[PDB]
Amino acid sequence: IHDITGKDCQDIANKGAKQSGLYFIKPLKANQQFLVYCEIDGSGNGWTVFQKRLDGSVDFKKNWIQYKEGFGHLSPTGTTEFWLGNEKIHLISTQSAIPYALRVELEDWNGRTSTADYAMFKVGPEADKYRLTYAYFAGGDAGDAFDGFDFGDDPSDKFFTSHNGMQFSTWDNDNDKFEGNCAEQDGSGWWMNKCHAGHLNGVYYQGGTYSKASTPNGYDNGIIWATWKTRWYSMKKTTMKIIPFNRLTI
């Protein structure tokens, strides 16, 4: 664990840290410091990573408290899977009304990475079930899955599968817009609607391709981002990371 600390990984970078790895941060309002993985590039950008998928090592079917507190494994090398914790993500993303960007980074099973950036990304408090909000989609070749997607299933698919303004759901705390339980169905925690167009906490399907035949109920419950790949393609790696918004300004 590195010595420099701050409010987030950008503060850490601003204080002269140059190496990606594990650092303590202590956002405003946090009761105690906590470890994070910071990705620090050669241009002084320090991203605070809150989700990582890369190998299927961690089961993302976790309950409300586990999603609140965080689960999985932090590593200095950035080679482990984790969910940082909704309370931590709330504390970082809302502190001092600092505008953060979210970057979603996806890797397919062929070694291509794509990104989707969201401006002014926030996660609300537990009293509002950790609601996700953003101001606008700021671009990227992965496309805007959080806007919802037309799967050709129902006329209202886009309304059913958008993510801005969705509360967080787990199997034991359903806050979705579905008469069923999206989190229980898929076995994940996420900002579910009815249910999703972008869902990075799904099941780790080896090799990417899966199908309705994969499960008895034919769930599209993989690690999906429908504006980049079919619902029947599950990413090999994902990263969800945040940075003060100005670090995006060219």
Ligand SMILES: [Ca+2]
């Ligand atoms: Ca429901």
